[PDB]
Symmetry: D2
Subunit: 347 residues, 4 copies
Amino acid sequence: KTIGVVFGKFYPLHTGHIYLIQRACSQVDELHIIMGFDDTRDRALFEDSAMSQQPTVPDRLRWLLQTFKYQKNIRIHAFNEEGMEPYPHGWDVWSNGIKKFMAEKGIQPDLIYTSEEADAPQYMEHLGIETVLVDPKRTFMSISGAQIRENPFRYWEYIPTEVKPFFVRTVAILGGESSGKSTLVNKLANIFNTTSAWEYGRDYVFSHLGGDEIALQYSDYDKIALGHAQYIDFAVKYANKVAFIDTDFVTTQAFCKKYEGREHPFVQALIDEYRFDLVILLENNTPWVADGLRSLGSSVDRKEFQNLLVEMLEENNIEFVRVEEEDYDSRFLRCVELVREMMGEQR
Amino acid sequence: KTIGVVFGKFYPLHTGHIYLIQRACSQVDELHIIMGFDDTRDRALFEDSAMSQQPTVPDRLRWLLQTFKYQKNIRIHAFNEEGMEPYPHGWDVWSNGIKKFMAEKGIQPDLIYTSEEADAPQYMEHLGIETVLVDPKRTFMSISGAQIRENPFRYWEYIPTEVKPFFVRTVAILGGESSGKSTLVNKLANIFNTTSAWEYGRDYVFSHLGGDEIALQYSDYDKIALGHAQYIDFAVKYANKVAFIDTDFVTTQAFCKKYEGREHPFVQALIDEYRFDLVILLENNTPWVADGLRSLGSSVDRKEFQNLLVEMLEENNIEFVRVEEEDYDSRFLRCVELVREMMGEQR
Amino acid sequence: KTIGVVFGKFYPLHTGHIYLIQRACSQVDELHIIMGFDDTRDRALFEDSAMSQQPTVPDRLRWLLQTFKYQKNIRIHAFNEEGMEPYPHGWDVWSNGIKKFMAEKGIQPDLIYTSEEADAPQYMEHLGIETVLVDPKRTFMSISGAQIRENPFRYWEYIPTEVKPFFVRTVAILGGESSGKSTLVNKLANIFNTTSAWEYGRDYVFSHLGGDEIALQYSDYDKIALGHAQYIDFAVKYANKVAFIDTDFVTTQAFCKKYEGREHPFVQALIDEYRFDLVILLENNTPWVADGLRSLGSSVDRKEFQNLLVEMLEENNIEFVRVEEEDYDSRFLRCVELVREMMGEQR
Amino acid sequence: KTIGVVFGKFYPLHTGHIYLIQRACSQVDELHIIMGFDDTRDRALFEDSAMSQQPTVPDRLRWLLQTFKYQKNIRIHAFNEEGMEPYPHGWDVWSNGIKKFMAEKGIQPDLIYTSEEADAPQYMEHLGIETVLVDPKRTFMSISGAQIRENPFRYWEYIPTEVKPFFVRTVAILGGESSGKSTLVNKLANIFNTTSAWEYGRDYVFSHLGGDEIALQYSDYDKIALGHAQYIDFAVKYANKVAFIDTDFVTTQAFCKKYEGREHPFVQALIDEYRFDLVILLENNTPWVADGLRSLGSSVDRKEFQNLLVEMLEENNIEFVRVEEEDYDSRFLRCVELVREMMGEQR
Ligand SMILES: NC(=O)c1ccc[n+]([C@@H]2O[C@H](COP(=O)([O-])OP(=O)(O)OC[C@H]3O[C@@H](n4cnc5c(N)ncnc54)[C@H](O)[C@@H]3O)[C@@H](O)[C@H]2O)c1
Ligand SMILES: NC(=O)c1ccc[n+]([C@@H]2O[C@H](COP(=O)([O-])OP(=O)(O)OC[C@H]3O[C@@H](n4cnc5c(N)ncnc54)[C@H](O)[C@@H]3O)[C@@H](O)[C@H]2O)c1
Ligand SMILES: NC(=O)c1ccc[n+]([C@@H]2O[C@H](COP(=O)([O-])OP(=O)(O)OC[C@H]3O[C@@H](n4cnc5c(N)ncnc54)[C@H](O)[C@@H]3O)[C@@H](O)[C@H]2O)c1
Ligand SMILES: NC(=O)c1ccc[n+]([C@@H]2O[C@H](COP(=O)([O-])OP(=O)(O)OC[C@H]3O[C@@H](n4cnc5c(N)ncnc54)[C@H](O)[C@@H]3O)[C@@H](O)[C@H]2O)c1
């Protein structure tokens, strides 16, 4: 009893929608969310926006599902509105489609919750369900979805953590052994006040092979890669407008192919799935420093792995940048301007 | 061996200082930070600022130590400058004191890193050490420490996560069991796009006593409270200008004293140590619903625990607010407006 | 609704009781366990047994509660039989007492589950409740509780992990800084194929103070102590008849008193609560090892801390042993010899 | 310098070898272990033994690497002795092969550590390196490797946690939706005093999709499987002679093929890699009980999934057992006799 229904494109979902839904859910015993999609309209919206990746219907479903995880009276549905006139001219076919969708899903709504004053009479006259206006003057939040899509980094405090991955500009740094990748990633995450992701390969090697790579085999090489992804998902979930990644899947695929002689289908699937906004490739220019934790001191093998990284980066058609400064300070500076140019703010 | 020294009040530490220190540390083999303090001056600065809690010398040492955890060439020292003329009249006694401080600490600095163009000649002529200017035009960051102290919620992206606990306005919600504390805390953390801390008591009970409180004893009551603190430290470390706390130490003292007959010194020390900016107290207005897990379903026991909570809140002289609305939506609105008044954002 | 009741002192609980309870609970909607205790009888049983620590009524309640944590239809109660007639007269007063106890606890049992052939007719005669015999020939398990109490290390596979802490012979190793405690504890845990507990203080310092001890304060010194306990609870929960502990609460109390001038009530409460079967004290025979973390390089301070450890060990009247061999191999041999003697079983 | 070398096939490694190696490592600055292998001899040894799975050279390397993880002065190598007459007549070419291996690996041994009285003069004559006898009377451990291979469950306390996975008899239980297999796995782990592994799919669904499977996609179906393996590795690492597994990879393959319409190469690779000693198939005897979390309440879908499970089990040539008894107590009993027959220890 007392069923509440919220309609919305939710593209993207922001804290105004959250405030609306959580003001509505405290007033009803069960709240149903129905989000409609159209492939061409959503594709155009993504094209004209500043999102890093294009969401799919399951991805936006995941947004809404992760937002209300600890609220047990909220259900989520996705609806298809192909072959319909756009708003506000397709007010007849859309209503019939939504009525059929509710009939299929068994929903018997009693109240419709909305924050548009002109849309309420239209809802009442078509869907025949009484509507309740929540925050009609937009006192809690005044920012609109278009302003968020155009400039997300100025309204960063209104974007939930589940919606953040499609707005975070992820930076992947690649480099040879003992090239200073980890310290550079840490410094970049520090000055930018954001998160970072470490190379899961070293963690896996120590926590499963006692710290030696002699016992590494083909079947292991697909855990590492997948484990690496579990770090990336973390760094992008809590980033401050930018996240930094210590190593790509190109490097793990390269290690797998060079040691075991054959590729791995799931690492290639991850390569295809995971696309990075900016990729930075360091060089082997820095002289070798003896440490004691790695006996692979030969620079010929380093150059061979670097060249194989270049060719495998070209194989998947992945764009990257090269930094050639021997000194660490200049390389840090150049990475700073690269990130700042990626941000899109000029001098 | 190419020693670099940075001087600073660092009160509070912000991303401009971080950028300075990490531009300096990549250029030297070892960077020493010397932080001078004066009790009365720092007390006045805290009084005139908007910080939630007053930092101590160990607390700011902890700031600087947690910032550069993964940078292994940075050392931190604290120095006392009592009985010295303020800047810039005290350019002679301070220099002698700081020189004696390096003498006692064994530092032999070679370079001093600073971002003040006017201060460089005094450094050169007093300490006899060449100075290096880093970002003299403040291109990377232009915000000053005073602007952060006066209005920290507008420059929130420049405050590190180690310095954040002394700026986050922590809200503690108190209420009886099965009164809706958890859902309210979750909703407040959702609409405000911030973190929250759950009641560690339930977690401890399930993970150590099989989910029943019959096996609870006096010596257990000091684990729970301390464990509760480990949640609070998390919520304030990642908050979006405000953190929400599900239960205070007053409640665990209440349970301990009512079930065991005696208090516990450590949880009282925690009460003294942990001070909250806003405390909200709910009522027993909501009717009891049979759950099969609590035998104290009578409203008499609930009222007794509520009155004991009130008297123990008065015993420690802790101010709080009372919300009496039976409906959930009105209570949520009252909590929202209380938090908004606490924010202080004027119109 | 189809209520089953199981009686027993469960002192200690073993896998025969577990098998009986699982077989009973697979056949009833809810199973109630009622365990009776008598102070003098239980004290005598503990005295004549080989348990390391004496359980209390809450401790045995915790055993039974942690055993059936994921079985949601099992309840647990404790009953008092003081002022009781001597055996075998204890079949009439005990029946009245249990009937009354079930009266205030509201239980209305329908079946009594037992594994005694002769006790069943007396149960039927006194309690008036039909009894069901489970495994009357003891096919699944034949070992009795007395054999477990006398020799627990020969029937180690029948003792649950919740009951194990009162049978594990915990060994605590104490020694000066950089004396080799960690490697010795690891070797002892390796050759004995068991668990160990690391010093939580180092972990806390690195994970909360950036790895330096300057930011350590009085209020911190309690967390460390409690954290240390959380390691001990782990090591004893999975030990192979013996668990090894890297540091006692005497050392953390010593550090707190030396660096603060006052003790801590909760560390003293932990000292009183936590009693170790064997305590081993090492010497300062090995030369100090430079690491870069300690400014107290003088051996005078090391000897002062060692003497303070001795005096604080004597203050609470805690017995210990001294190992004085300079070489590591002989010290390992002496530790093995001491542990083997403390086992008490020669072959 | 003081280099020490230990020889042995370590097939399997037991606590006598650990005691030898850790008595030798305290006496030398660096210890080297060299495992010689022969494919046919090792295959015959595995055939005549009672191991559940056949180790490979990397697997035994992993044993030795994980055992001495926290001992930093131990290195591990593998050596090939193809075309060698067995001991003790192949004492001539074997010495030359080991000398060449020393030359390749750069080892310059100073002492050889062994526990054989007759081999010491032979070692001195051939390898020309002084030998040290450790525990020649086998006082600490007297059990031999052959006794462990023939009967591992009577010397279970001598098998390290790294070697245990190749001796644990893993049991995998398969059942329909809401068939109660988790409680059965828990009961079996309880009465056998061992570990178990839960279905990682439910955990992944709640922790990544808000608790609903609507947002499940093809690329997700490969994390779940991998995550499931991470549970299995745990359960077998701490098992008491037997580990219980809640779900196989056949079920996740079934779900992936049924919903997404296509298989996944990595889950098939896991199927090939992970072979279980006993597989138990639970059918749909128990009637479906409505809960509100699954809308496929019809038994037709359950029957279809069971039939697809059967055909995919037959496709991979995996043997299994069907338990059709309705009673939960009877099914628990039947699983008990199945596990006991697998144990092979009769009356
Ligand atoms: N011709 C058509 O195709 C048909 C025509 C009639 C219906 N519309 C449908 O109506 C649906 C509604 O789309 P939408 O534009 O409203 O999506 P939306 O995400 O922009 O809005 C979702 C809801 O949240 C409310 N809201 C937004 N910001 C708020 C804030 N700051 N505070 C409080 N509330 C706020 C909105 O008033 C709205 O009710 C569309 O999916 C669309 O399919 C389309
Ligand atoms: N008491 C006296 O008379 C004596 C006189 C001479 C020395 N001073 C001492 O010198 C110390 C210096 O303190 P402070 O006032 O510089 O504290 P501060 O935190 O404001 O400065 C810290 C350092 O960081 C630099 N910095 C600040 N913002 C920056 C930004 N956005 N980008 C780059 N760099 C930035 C500053 O130039 C400064 O060098 C004082 O603590 C004080 O003890 C005092
Ligand atoms: N003076 C008297 O009249 C008499 C004296 C002895 C018993 N006590 C009463 O009896 C109670 C204690 O009962 P208890 O002695 O049976 O406790 P118990 O722990 O020895 O046994 C508990 C239950 O587990 C069963 N069991 C034990 N081992 C088993 C195995 N290997 N397999 C299957 N089942 C197994 C036992 O048959 C028993 O039913 C006391 O609380 C007290 O109330 C009174
Ligand atoms: N090709 C062949 O068949 C044959 C030919 C030459 C000799 N072996 C070679 O020599 C080595 C074989 O050594 P192994 O058979 O002794 O392997 P092993 O696993 O049986 O023992 C390895 C070492 O551990 C010692 N040890 C075993 N149990 C002990 C205990 N309880 N306490 C203390 N020490 C204990 C042994 O004395 C031995 O030194 C291999 O490298 C192998 O290649 C092979």
